[PDB]
Design a protein around this ligand. Structure first.
Ligand SMILES: CCC[C@H]1C(=O)CC(=O)O[C@@H]1CC(=O)/C(C)=C/C[C@@H]1O[C@@](C)(CCO)C[C@@H]1C
Ligand SMILES: CCC[C@H]1C(=O)CC(=O)O[C@@H]1CC(=O)/C(C)=C/C[C@@H]1O[C@@](C)(CCO)C[C@@H]1C
Ligand SMILES: CCC[C@H]1C(=O)CC(=O)O[C@@H]1CC(=O)/C(C)=C/C[C@@H]1O[C@@](C)(CCO)C[C@@H]1C
Ligand SMILES: CCC[C@H]1C(=O)CC(=O)O[C@@H]1CC(=O)/C(C)=C/C[C@@H]1O[C@@](C)(CCO)C[C@@H]1C
Lengths: 121, 121, 121, 121
């Protein structure tokens, strides 16, 4: 169900690193679209740092008049959720859009990945 | 459910600006595929004007023998609907096609966005 | 439901022009991926001829060792079905693939369109 | 349902060639993204060899520090399942991703196909 995805967004968006991390199965992975290949894999014990570093990135974006807006997850059965994301300037300009994929197993996240429109570095 | 999406198409297609606007949550956004970026964001109080201006555009299209045809929304659970759109000439020629995304929250539209085949200016 | 889509494939695949045509609403359209634009629109009374001409095309393909294989439609609620198509040579070579979109209204087809991988003329 | 897809992954991943093969209808096809065209068709009696040869390929990949990870299938009704695949290096680098399509009929696989991001030879 969507509860673990909701919990993840709320806790990770406030810096409750420990709650956010615990949304992931011990074998779960969070794939970010950076690095040599199509992405970089983060395991559960890499994910707390990742959250912290993405929060710091978000603050720089905000200071520039840009921020991401995440919609409530759309569930496809119990084990998959799609989250629409839109990155917008305060002037009303979409600068990026994408979909966060969540694959769940047993109420935990086993895969978080993103598909984005603009391949930002 | 699809009722608010249906209400939106019927009212906005006839110029009932006030009913159409009220289909959107106060925090909702309607993204149009124009502007510097991947689109331009319209908030609820920008949406009435937008409807009026798109109706005027539609009349110019019709006078040229071109018009858009929208299918009934296909629901994915309660909170997402997809609307197929086809732009056709009176001679039977598809000139554009796309999908209108609706994300709902609490019976209101929180995101209307479009994906189109031809990136028309 | 899928019955009208199944009926359409069975009847149109055997040349029962009248049954196939009657699967379409009077306002339905069948879009083929040929012509000046992204496709060409066929109304209900253009569709019988279209079926005949596509059957004749299919026979030429078969004589060349190529044929299309259609899977059973995958339903998304009552009013949308997706049909996977694969075009294969008798030597085991996929030469095209795509998805037939069916949008239904009231048990009739209101839109049949195709998305294909190879933009064959 | 997903049972036949699960059975197929478990048995084919261990070399139980006979169980894996019997997951396919007698008319089923497994399409691999190699060959002259958009893929190559394997019938039921070609599929055992295919499994063996893909296992041997997998062992070479593993010896290079690369392996594929398959998620549990996401069902769309009874007759379609999507399986997310990610190919990763042991250093945490996604090198390929895709989706395995399964179309079922009567509890058997009638079509297995893949869509991949990187068109690897
Ligand atoms: C993992 C890739 C990140 C990108 C996507 O996933 C979709 C996209 O294109 O934009 C994203 C970047 C973005 O704009 C924001 C606001 C990231 C913030 C983070 O958001 C949380 C809630 C986790 C989800 O990322 C905690 C952080 C504050
Ligand atoms: C917001 C982008 C507009 C495009 C799409 O969304 C999908 C696409 O490619 O074509 C569209 C343009 C089009 O052809 C029409 C008929 C617009 C009319 C408007 O339609 C209403 C019902 C609202 C929905 O747009 C009120 C207006 C009369
Ligand atoms: C309308 C576009 C046609 C293409 C698609 O729709 C998907 C695709 O890429 O290949 C198709 C062409 C094809 O290979 C066949 C076998 C057409 C035969 C016709 O099939 C029937 C059953 C109607 C459905 O087309 C009656 C005809 C004998
Ligand atoms: C049929 C195309 C193969 C590719 C995909 O399907 C998705 C993708 O991009 O990567 C795949 C290649 C891959 O990395 C692995 C691990 C193949 C192993 C095989 O996996 C089993 C379980 C069958 C499913 O393939 C038995 C074999 C050991």
């Amino acid at each position: 169900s969507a509860e673990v995805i909701d919990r993840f967004f709320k806790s990770s968006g406030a810096g409750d690193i420990e709650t956010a991390v615990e949304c992931f199965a011990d074998d779960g992975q969070w794939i970010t679209p950076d690095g040599d290949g199509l992405g970089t894999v983060h395991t559960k014990d890499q994910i707390g740092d990742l959250i912290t570093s993405m929060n710091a990135m978000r603050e720089k974006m905000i200071a520039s008049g840009v921020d991401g807006k995440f919609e409530s997850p759309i569930m496809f059965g119990e084990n998959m959720g799609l989250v629409r994301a839109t990155v917008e300037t305060d002037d009303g300009k979409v600068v990026n859009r994408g979909v966060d994929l969540f694959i769940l197993s047993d109420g935990k996240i086993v895969l978080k990945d993103v598909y984005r429109k603009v391949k930002l570095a």
